[PDB]
Ligand binder design. Structure first.
Ligand code: NA
Ligand SMILES: [Zn+2]
Ligand SMILES: [Zn+2]
Lengths: 11, 69
């Protein structure tokens, strides 16, 4: 299927 | 880019999946899809194809996300 996923990261 | 989901809390939760038929988006977690790997090749939302799905749980999860922002 078609998906959208947002990743939030901190370095 | 319209979110229409069974929780009736249609803001972006960071992981959405697009219905193959109506092209509206759902929260994957409301449909029990915990990660991309759990998403099937073919996918229809509950409006386009009624399924057994825990609507109260979906609302609970999304309402909780909103309540702790
Ligand atoms: Na369905
Ligand atoms: Zn939802
Ligand atoms: Zn649909």
């Amino acid at each position: 299927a078609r998906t959208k996923q947002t990743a939030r990261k901190s370095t | 880019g319209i979110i229409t989901c069974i929780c009736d809390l249609n803001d972006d939760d960071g992981f959405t999946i697009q219905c193959d038929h109506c092209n509206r988006w759902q929260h994957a977690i409301c449909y029990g899809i915990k990660d991309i790997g759990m998403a099937p090749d073919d996918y229809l939302c509950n409006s386009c194809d009624p399924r057994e799905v825990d609507i109260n749980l979906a609302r609970k999860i999304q309402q909780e996300r909103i309540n702790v922002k």
